[PDB]
C-alpha cells in the first residue's frame, strides 16, 4: 500500500450534492487530487455500481489511484483532470440528464469506466507513438492501458461479474473508448442525425443503442465547451497550451469553428434524445456567443 491509498481508503465520501457532481456546470479547478478521487468513488456509488457488482472498497480505490497515476501531469489538457471531467459529465448526463433510465446497469458501468479511461497515458496531441504502419491508433492504446489496469492485482473492479457479463462489459468499454476518436464520430454521426430528423430514433435497437453510446461518449469528452464562460475560457487556455506550446488572436476563431463543426449538432441531437441535457446545448450556445464576439474584436 501507498500513503495515498491509505488516506483515500480511510476517507469519508461526501454526498453527491456536497460534491456538486450533478451540475452540468461542475468544475474541478479548486479540487485536490484526493477530492477528485472521492468524487469518483461517489459516482460509482450513486450509480449503484458498487452495490450491483460487489466492489471491495480497497479495490475500487486502488483502481482509481491507478487510473489517475497513468495519466501524465506534464500534459496540459489531456490528463487526469480531463478524464475526471469527462466522467463527471457522464454522471450528470445520467442523473440530471435523466439518461440512466434508458440504459442497462452494464452499459452504465461500462460508460463510467470508459469515461475515466478513454485517454489513459495520452502524451499531448503533438506527440508520436510509432508501430508498424497506419485504425484509431491512440484509442486502441488507451483501451490497452485500461484493460491492463482492470486486470492488475488489487485493481479488478470487475471480479464480481460472471464471464458473460464481463465479456459484454468489455466489448462496450472498448467501443466507448474508440468512439472518442473524432474521426469515428464524424463517420458515424450522419446516421445518428438522419434517425433523429426522420423521427425514427429507437434505443431498443441494438445497432442504434451502440451508436447512441458512441455519441454520448463524444458529448462528455467535449463537454468542456459547454461550461460557464469563466471556466470555458480557462480550459480553452489549457487546450491552447497543449496545442501550441508542447498568436492567441486566431483562437476565438478556431473555437467558433470547433463549435460549429462538431459540438452544436451533437448537443442538439443529445437534447432530442433527452430534454434534460438541454443545459449542455445551452452552455455551448452561450460560449459561441462569447467566442464570436471576441473573434470580431479581432
Ligand atoms: C483554444 C485552442 C484551440 O482549440 C481548438 C482549435 C481547433 C479545433 S478543431 O476542431 O478545428 N480540430 C480538432 C482536431 N484536432 C485537434 C485539430 C483541430 C479544436 C479546438 C478545441 N478542441 C477541443 C477538444 C480537445 C477543446 F476542448 C477545445 O476547447 N478546443
Ligand atoms: Mg493536490
Ligand atoms: Mg481525445
Ligand atoms: Mg488479485
Ligand atoms: Zn478526451
Swiss-Prot record:
Summary of the tissues where the protein is detected: Expressed in aortic smooth muscle cells, heart, placenta, skeletal muscle and pancreas and, to a much lesser extent, in brain, liver and lung.
Residue positions binding Mg(2+): 119
Ranges of residues in domain PDEase: 1-298
Outcome recorded upon mutating residue 291 to Y: Changes substrate selectivity from cGMP-specific to dual cAMP and cGMP binding and hydrolysis
Any single biological process term in GO: cAMP-mediated signaling
Active site residues of this protein: 78 (proton donor)
The organism's place on the tree of life at top rank: Eukaryota
Keywords: Allosteric enzyme, cGMP, cGMP-binding, Hydrolase, Metal-binding, Nucleotide-binding, Phosphoprotein, Repeat, Zinc
UniProt function note: Plays a role in signal transduction by regulating the intracellular concentration of cyclic nucleotides. This phosphodiesterase catalyzes the specific hydrolysis of cGMP to 5'-GMP. Specifically regulates nitric-oxide-generated cGMP.
Free-text comment about domains: Composed of a C-terminal catalytic domain containing two putative divalent metal sites and an N-terminal regulatory domain which contains two homologous allosteric cGMP-binding regions, A and B.
Full protein name: cGMP-specific 3',5'-cyclic phosphodiesterase
Origin species: Homo sapiens
Encoding gene per record: PDE5A
Full-length numbering of the shown residues: 536 to 860 of 875
Amino acid at each position: 500500500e501507498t500513503r495515498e491509498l491509505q488516506s483515500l481508503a480511510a476517507a469519508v465520501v461526501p454526498s453527491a450534492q456536497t460534491l456538486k457532481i450533478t451540475d452540468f456546470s461542475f468544475s474541478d479547478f479548486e479540487l485536490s487530487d484526493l477530492e477528485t478521487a472521492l468524487c469518483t468513488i461517489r459516482m460509482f456509488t450513486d450509480l449503484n455500481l458498487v452495490q450491483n457488482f460487489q466492489m471491495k472498497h480497497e479495490v475500487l480505490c486502488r483502481w482509481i489511484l491507478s487510473v489517475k497515476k497513468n495519466y501524465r501531469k506534464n500534459v496540459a489538457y489531456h490528463n487526469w483532470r480531463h478524464a475526471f471531467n469527462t466522467a463527471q459529465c457522464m454522471f450528470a448526463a445520467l442523473k440530471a440528464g435523466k439518461i440512466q433510465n434508458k440504459l442497462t446497469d452494464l452499459e452504465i458501468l461500462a460508460l463510467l469506466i470508459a469515461a475515466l479511461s478513454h485517454d489513459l497515458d495520452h502524451r499531448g496531441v503533438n506527440n508520436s507513438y510509432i508501430q508498424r504502419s497506419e485504425h484509431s491508433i491512440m484509442e486502441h492504446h488507451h483501451f490497452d492501458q485500461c484493460l491492463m489496469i482492470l486486470n492488475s492485482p488489487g485493481n479488478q473492479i470487475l471480479s464480481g461479474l460472471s464471464i458473460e457479463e464481463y465479456k459484454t462489459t468489455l466489448k462496450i468499454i472498448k467501443q466507448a473508448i474508440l468512439a472518442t476518436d473524432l474521426a469515428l464520430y464524424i463517420k458515424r454521426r450522419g446516421e445518428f442525425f438522419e434517425l433523429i430528423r426522420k423521427n425514427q430514433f429507437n434505443l431498443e435497437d441494438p445497432h442504434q443503442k451502440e451508436l447512441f453510446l458512441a455519441m454520448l461518449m463524444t458529448a462528455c469528452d467535449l463537454s468542456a465547451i459547454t461550461k460557464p464562460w469563466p471556466i470555458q475560457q480557462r480550459i480553452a487556455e489549457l487546450v491552447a497550451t497543449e496545442f501550441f506550446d508542447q498568436k492567441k488572436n486566431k483562437i476565438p476563431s478556431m473555437q467558433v469553428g470547433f463549435i460549429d463543426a462538431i459540438c452544436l449538432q451533437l448537443y442538439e441531437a443529445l437534447t432530442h434524445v433527452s430534454e434534460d441535457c438541454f443545459p449542455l446545448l445551452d452552455g455551448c450556445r452561450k460560449n459561441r456567443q462569447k467566442w464570436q464576439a471576441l473573434a470580431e474584436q479581432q
